[PDB]
């Protein structure tokens with residue numbers, strides 16, 4: 088078998104001529120030549136089976152991505168693994184190969200207002216589909232936005248996704264949370280489990296702000312610093328918004344802070360299109376109940392050159408997990424991953 092930077096990559100005979108792309112906690116990613124479709128593809132080698140959290144992420148992504156079909160959402164083309172549960176130590180996920188991601192692009196390139204517009208449109212168009220399936224992505228950030236050489240955009244990494252559950256969103260103050268800090272809505276630190284669609288709108292808001300300046304808008308250095316940064320720009324929440332926070336720890340924390348005025352978007356973003364800043368304000372609303380929804384955001388003046396609801400498709404039906412996954416041992420989750428990848432086996 089081919090080796091890449093001291094790792095077996097058992098993807099043959101279909102996939103050859105591998106090149107390293109990258110690596111992270113998830114595993115390792117290569118490009119490979121696909122000898123059936125005669126195209127280079129992305130292959131990621133995941134080795135999740137010793138970690139319940141890794142098995143959860145692998146299973147959620149696979150189930151979601153094999154169900155969903157949308158231009159602004161990465162597909163799974165193929166999955167390679169051993170013929171038996173006993174012999175299966177790795178899962179290789181084959182996906183369309185993209186040139187870059189928005190994280191890398193923002194560190195190296197100024198985006199024209201027209202690029203910002205088009206990128207935001209594609210993000211919201213993909214998100215409309217995801218929300219229409221009653222799914223929350225829950226980890227939207229530049230590195231989860233893949234781009235090709237013509238700036239077509241695809242959302243990736245559905246391993247933190249969940250079905251929306253607005254009736255069970257309430258929790259206590261500073262309750263611990265997994266998703267990426269600079270893109271976390273204020274309510275996560277105050278009273279929310281991140282089980283409503285407004286969590287994703289907040290993250291998109293953060294992405295938009297970052298496209299305008301090439302710098303994250305709320306770069307908290309650590310957990311409660313994240314809310315400091317948010318309140319530093321939004322200012323003190325209104326009495327009405329504060330009254331929506333019924334938990335006393337969270338309420339009284341907010342009341343203890345000195346009055347801060349709103350920093351106006353046109354001072355933070357002096358070169359930005361005014362319509363972009365109006366949409367930005369609506370996405371970065373403190374109160375998640377008042378926060379714009381994905382379909383309204385698509386209908387916003389800033390996106391008028393692109394808006395076409397007949398060309399912004401929705402999912403055929405809501406997505407459901409057959410069983411609750413968070414209370415399943417890694418051994419059961421491995422069984423479910425085996426089952427879920429069975430359709431790619433010869434036979």
Ligand SMILES: COc1cc(F)cc([C@@H](CO)NC(=O)[C@@H](C)N2Cc3ccc(-c4nc(NC5CCOCC5)ncc4Cl)cc3C2=O)c1
Pocket residue numbers: 108109111112113114116129131133134135140141142144145148161182183184185186187188191233243244245246247
């Ligand atoms: C601890 O964490 C874990 C544990 C797990 F058990 C499973 C996961 C899974 C599910 O949650 N998560 C991921 O796999 C995330 C983290 N990533 C990594 C990754 C690398 C490359 C590409 C990619 N990249 C390209 N092209 C690149 C772009 C940049 O520039 C260079 C070319 N094209 C096509 C593709 Cl799918 C996509 C992804 C992706 O989804 C995570």
